[PDB]
């Protein structure tokens, strides 16, 4: 509390969320991206739009948000508002009529090493080509392209957290069965 | 009586919301006692996901849950317990329901 209050005041005295959080401008920010599918809300065949409820786990290091726990009573991790810090601008490229970027700015888990974990929720409305030839015995391959809208790979690198999406907390659907899932 | 945004709040949200809305409808005000106890009673309009058992429709009964938890803080930071003041139930005021 008092230790964390002092730590937050120290961290955000001269902080800037404009520039990338790197020691050197020639360094690359590595952002681990992990998509968790919570729910398959709807498959819209007419408008070719799949609605999903997802958690977009993002992990990266901030060079300037580091501290020694011994100088602040042993605090090793804190929660801070995500609006105060630099974040990657991940955008759903195939967004159909929903939000392009994250709009629910939940808190980030910040470690003393500068490691950030940000896991905001989102409603992804994605544009998927629906093949209705075999309906209602039809199989649909529907994708979600994610990337940093304004940053290229030479300043911000993205890598999947895992080879597959996280379906551990996936609610069963009464209309669809997910045969396969994978992130490339 | 202090505005809720002025004090620390636990980030308790409806995890199983269906429309993407996690938060309360109106922040209102907390009631702070002299001993540091904070009571907050925000209103909420919630749309929660409920898997419908369709077998006996319309002569059916449903089991619709509202999962409430902190979105950020782990169990080592914020611990939850059922509210009472051994009444582990949703309170329905008979006159005004």
């Amino acid at each position: 509390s008092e230790h964390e209050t002092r730590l937050v005041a120290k961290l955000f005295k001269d902080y800037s969320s404009v520039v990338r959080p790197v020691e050197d401008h020639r360094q690359v920010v590595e952002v681990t991206v992990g998509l968790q599918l919570i729910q398959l809300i709807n498959v819209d065949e007419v408008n070719q739009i799949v609605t999903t409820n997802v958690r977009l786990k993002q992990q990266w290091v901030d060079y300037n948000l580091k501290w020694n726990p011994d100088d602040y009573g042993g605090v090793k991790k804190i929660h801070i508002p995500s609006e105060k810090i630099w974040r990657p601008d991940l955008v759903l490229y195939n967004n159909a009529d929903g939000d392009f970027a994250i709009v629910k700015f939940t808190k980030v888990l910040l470690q003393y090493t500068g490691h950030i974990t940000w896991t905001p929720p989102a409603i992804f409305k994605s544009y998927c080509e629906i093949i209705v030839t075999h309906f209602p015995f039809d199989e649909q391959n529907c994708s979600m392209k994610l990337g940093t809208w304004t940053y290229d790979g030479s300043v911000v690198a993205i890598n999947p957290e895992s080879d597959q999406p996280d379906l551990s907390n996936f609610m069963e659907s009464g209309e669809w069965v997910i045969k396969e899932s994978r992130g490339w | 009586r202090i505005t809720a945004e002025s004090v620390w709040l636990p980030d308790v949200v409806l995890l199983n919301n269906n429309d993407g809305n996690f938060d309360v409808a109106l922040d209102i005000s907390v009631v702070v006692s002299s001993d540091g106890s904070v009571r907050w009673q925000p209103p909420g309009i919630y749309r929660s996901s409920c898997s419908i058992q369709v077998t006996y429709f319309p002569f059916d009964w449903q089991n619709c849950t509202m999962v409430f938890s902190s979105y950020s803080y782990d169990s080592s930071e914020v611990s939850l317990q059922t509210g009472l003041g051994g009444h582990q139930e949703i309170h329905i005021h008979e006159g005004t329901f």
Partner: peptide, 28 residues
């Protein structure tokens, strides 16, 4: 109330609403 205003000023001096209340590290 002037007394209520003074009490509010006393309470919220150095208060950070983004910091979880924990007097010692490890307090839940």
């Amino acid at each position: 109330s002037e007394a209520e205003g003074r009490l509010r000023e006393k309470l919220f001096s150095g208060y950070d609403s983004s910091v979880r209340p924990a007097r010692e590290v490890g307090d839940r």
